[PDB]
Every structure is written in C-alpha cells, then in structure tokens.
Amino acid sequence: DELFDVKNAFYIGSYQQCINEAQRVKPSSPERDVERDVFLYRAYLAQRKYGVVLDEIKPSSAPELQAVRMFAEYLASHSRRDAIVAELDREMSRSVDVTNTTFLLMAASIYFYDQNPDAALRTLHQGDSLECMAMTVQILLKLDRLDLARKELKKMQDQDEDATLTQLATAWVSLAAGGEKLQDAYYIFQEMADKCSPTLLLLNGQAACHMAQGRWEAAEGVLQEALDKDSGHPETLINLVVLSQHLGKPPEVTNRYLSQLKDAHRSHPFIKEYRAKENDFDRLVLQYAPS
Amino acid sequence: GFFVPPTKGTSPTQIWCNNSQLPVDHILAGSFETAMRLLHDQVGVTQFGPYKQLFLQTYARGRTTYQALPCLPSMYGYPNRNWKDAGLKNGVPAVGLKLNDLIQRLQLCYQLTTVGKFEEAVEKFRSILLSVPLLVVDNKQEIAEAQQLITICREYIVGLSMETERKKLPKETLEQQKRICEMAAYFTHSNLQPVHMILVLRTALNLFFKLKNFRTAAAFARRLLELGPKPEVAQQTRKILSACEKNPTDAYQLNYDMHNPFDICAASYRPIYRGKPVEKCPLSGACYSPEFKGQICKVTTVTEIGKDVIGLRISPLQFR
C-alpha cells in the first residue's frame, strides 16, 4: 500500500503529518489518487478545518469525496443536519451501493452523531473494510456491549493482527474490559507513540489507561506533555480536571481547567452535559426545598 | 436475517449506582436525584442549594476520556476503586476525596479561629461538615473519625456563630449585659481545643469581672489557668483571680449553671439542661429547642432539625 503512512498517520491522530504526506504522495492510479484525497480531507476535518473541505470538494469531485463533503457540512452547519440525515436516509434506502466503503464510513459517521447507532451499525454491516470493523467495534463499545465488540475484534484480529487499526481497536476493548486488560491497553498506546509519534490522541489514551488503574501520578506527565502542545484540547482538559482532584490540587485548579474548556470549545458535549447537570440540580433543589 | 440491531448493555455509571448506597458514588455517576435521595434519607438533607458546587465538582471527576476513531465522538472511561476484581458488573467508582483531606483542612479552620476571622472559619468548617457524607471510608475506626470530625465542625460553628451574635447585641441595659455574659459563658462549654478554649475563657473572665459576678469569675479563672496559657495571660489571670477572692460573690443571678449539663440552642443561643426536650440536626448533632423542629438547621444550612434518619453512610461496612 502506497498510502500506508498517510492512513496510519491519520488513525493515530497526527493529522498535519497525514496532510503533509498526503501531498508528497504521487497518484499512480485514479483509484489511489481518490483514496489519497479522501484521507487528505478526512485529516482537515479532524483539524476542524471544515471550510477547507467544503470549498475544495466541488460537485464534479469523486463520489468518495462527496461523502466526505457530506460529513463536512453536517459537522459545520448545525441547521443543515436534519436535511442531511433526510437525504442520507433516502440515499441509503433508495439505492444499494456498497463497494464505496468511504460512503459507508461517512454515512455511518453522520448516523453516529445523529445518535442513531442502529443506522450507523446497519450501514457498516454492509461494508467490508478493516476500518468498517474498527468503527463497528467503537460503536458496539459505546453501546456497552463488550461481548459484541469482542466478536468484531477477533473478526479483524484474524484478518490483520498487526494493523495499527486492529491494535487500536484492541486497546479500546481492553480499556472497556477493565482489570488486567488495562495494562495491555497501556502498552499498545505507548508502543504506538514510541514507533510513530506521541499524538494528543495517543497521549490521552496512555493517560486513560494509567488512571483506570489508580496511577494518577504517572498520568501527570503525559497530560502535561499534551497540554503543552495544545491548550484547549478537549480530552486533555477533561482528564486534567479528573486528575487534579485525585492529586489533591487546589479546587481552583479543577475549575481553571473547566473554564479553559469552555474557552476553547463553547459547545463541547462535556460542557453541555455539565450545564445539564447544573439544570436538573436546580430543578431538584426546588423538588426537596421547603415551600 | 443477518443484521439485527443490537440492544444497549448497562452503562458503567448505572452499575455504580446498582452497586453502592454511598452518596458520593451516585454523584460520581451523575445520578443526582438518586444521590440526593440517599443524602435525604441517611442524613436529613432537605435544602440542597448549598450542595451545588460539591455535586458538580464531584461529578466532573467521575469519568476520564480518550479518543477512538478520529472525527467521531470520544470515549469515556470510568475508573473503579476496585478495578482489579471489578467484573463488568461489580465496579464501584475510584475514590477522589479522603478523610485525611478533610482532617487536613481543619487546620486552616483552626488558624482562622485563632486569628479571629470567625466568619471565614465558619465557612471552611461548614465546608468540611458538608463534605464528610461524601467520603468512602475503609475501616470501622475511620468511620468514628468521620463522626468525630463532623462533631468538631458543629461545635465550632455554633460556638463561633453564638459569639459573633453576642458581639452584635447592645450593651446598655443591665439586662443586655447579663445576656452578653450568659452567651460568653455558654461558649465556655463548647469543646474546642485548648488554644481556643483559653481564648473564650479569657473573654468570659473579663465580662464576669466587670459584672461584679466575682464568684463565677474565679471559677473561670481557675479553669483557664489549668489549660496552661502563655505566661503573660497566666499572670493577668492570677491577678484577676486574687481580686475576685477579695469579694467571692456574684452580684446578679444569671441564667447559667456551670455544673448542670448543657446543650446550646444553635438558633436562640440559650441553655437546654440535662433531660429537657431537644430537637437535633440528624447530621451535625446540633441542638435546638423543640420550637425549631422541622426547620432548616442554622449550623448545617441544608438539614432538617426534626428529621428521623438512617444515619451517616460512608462505608460499605455499614451495610451488614
């Protein structure tokens, strides 16, 4: 595979590296050229550079790219979402293509965000790529069905025991299994960061594994390193909040991280949930409070 | 058939709830209504307003996070305190607040008291008091320390609160002055630590001296000296005590008995002797005269004075 690095860089979370290599690569196949552009924009999407994708992917672009652009508008325009899912529903039923794996992945991605695991899963069930399996594993995990997740894992475990995609999938499953499996997860995240590079994604994976076991002090370093690369990185700030309280830091510390999160991403799901908790608490105060 | 949509498994947070009866475990799980109910039944919390920051803050440390596939919603981790043996059914949340942390903060309260910042002292003190039911203690003695830690907090809260009021009352009438002396003498019975117990005895001595109630003053003087105050204070005290012996008699009869077991009304600041009827905060042990039953405790700020309860629950040990 000529796009091995490009894809790998993408999956482990170093998007700029993915974008840089994507451009250094030379087509050598109208197929490969499309595969490359697909990852190039998947990467810009990971960096939240929606405009770049929306502007550059035009109507005459390959259908694979169109799928990517579909996700891009869903991600960018909050209003256009129901209209997109609607068209996605129609395209998904009024037609039957499956050879286009990129479409399945993008479509499944939209369904994932639309909180419709069944549709995402139903879509992915039609695909046949190693990524389709990893995404299926992810969704099964969020559905708290570790059992179904283990099955999909072995499915991809038999197909490519050493693909970084299979290794990451195994780490997620291990993190979900708990106990001994936790150290397994830690090592794959550490090895990955060592071989490739210590991406914000991999750093937080390591930190999650350390904190799973009660090693709060060992998580300090990786979180420091991640924060030093991007203040405002969601996962890092959240984990810092959790970590601060376990290390006994001054309560203002936990709060600073919380505020820093609101600054960098006003509408992150974790911020929305926090707000929701504040709401039903006020609501519950009224429920118990004397009249 | 082939594709069948799979059905949700049970979420880790739900597991925690199904697994514990400890308030903090439910707060950590985001189960506020459940947590509030536990706090309401075990202790008697009814006014959860001043518990907002504790909840949100506690809740914010409940789950870690990490990414899976790029561009998709991130994953949440739910660290367990029993991560080794916790199956996928027996997990219980990691512990993020311990008894030692609370005991440690007690020193800042002690500091504040000594330097006279009573108001800030009551806050820190109340803050610890409200935090005890949020612990996950291990052994039976650790449970006793928690109860004793709560006791210390209310003792100082009603003691200092009483004092700050006495300092507000007017000092014109003889009656107004008999009232101040009384309150000052009531403080004398709070169980603080020697350095503070001495500071309030020193105060009562002066008030009672000026009220020419020398016989009672001599007793305060003797209790102060036995506490071993700094040299200068001890000397002053011996001086006042010899003065009192020149006329060992109390001018006015006051509503205070130094030899009859008390219990200060945490709202009115008046004595409720030995077996008289009393209503107590189900959480702090604070005492109130029967009138106040059913009202929100002034010490706790969140508790209901009359309320019957199961009792503080901060350890699995407590569920035989």
Swiss-Prot record, chain A:
InterPro entries per the UniProt record, alphabetical: Coatomer_esu (IPR006822), TPR-like_helical_dom_sf (IPR011990)
GO biological process terms, semicolon-separated: endoplasmic reticulum to Golgi vesicle-mediated transport; intra-Golgi vesicle-mediated transport; protein localization to axon; protein transport; retrograde vesicle-mediated transport, Golgi to endoplasmic reticulum
Keyword Disulfide bond appears in the UniProt entry: no
Keyword tags: Cytoplasm, Cytoplasmic vesicle, ER-Golgi transport, Golgi apparatus, Membrane, Phosphoprotein, Protein transport, Transport, Ubl conjugation
Post-translational note: Polyubiquitinated by RCHY1 in the presence of androgen, leading to proteasomal degradation.
Annotated compartments: Cytoplasm; Golgi apparatus membrane; Cytoplasmic vesicle, COPI-coated vesicle membrane
GO molecular function: structural molecule activity
Record's GO cellular component terms: COPI vesicle coat; Golgi membrane; nucleoplasm
Modified residues (Phosphoserine): 29
Major localization class: cytoplasm
SUPFAM superfamilies to which the protein is assigned, alphabetical: TPR-like
Membrane topology: Peripheral membrane protein
Amino-acid biosynthesis is among the record's keywords: no
Role played: The coatomer is a cytosolic protein complex that binds to dilysine motifs and reversibly associates with Golgi non-clathrin-coated vesicles, which further mediate biosynthetic protein transport from the ER, via the Golgi up to the trans Golgi network. The coatomer complex is required for budding from Golgi membranes, and is essential for the retrograde Golgi-to-ER transport of dilysine-tagged proteins.
Similarity field: Belongs to the COPE family.
Assembly, per entry: Oligomeric complex that consists of at least the alpha, beta, beta', gamma, delta, epsilon and zeta subunits.
Protein name (Swiss-Prot/TrEMBL): Coatomer subunit epsilon
Source organism (scientific name): Bos taurus
Lineage: Eukaryota, Metazoa, Chordata, Craniata, Vertebrata
From Swiss-Prot, chain B:
Compartment annotation: Cytoplasm; Golgi apparatus membrane; Cytoplasmic vesicle, COPI-coated vesicle membrane
Modified residues (Omega-N-methylarginine): 61
Phosphoserine found at: 289
Subunit comment: Oligomeric complex that consists of at least the alpha, beta, beta', gamma, delta, epsilon and zeta subunits. Interacts with SCYL1. Interacts with JAGN1. Interacts with TMEM41B. Interacts with SVEP1. Probably interacts with PEX11A.
Function: The coatomer is a cytosolic protein complex that binds to dilysine motifs and reversibly associates with Golgi non-clathrin-coated vesicles, which further mediate biosynthetic protein transport from the ER, via the Golgi up to the trans Golgi network. Coatomer complex is required for budding from Golgi membranes, and is essential for the retrograde Golgi-to-ER transport of dilysine-tagged proteins.
Listed name of the protein: Coatomer subunit alpha
Gene encoding the protein: COPA
Part of the intact protein present: 905 to 1224 of 1224
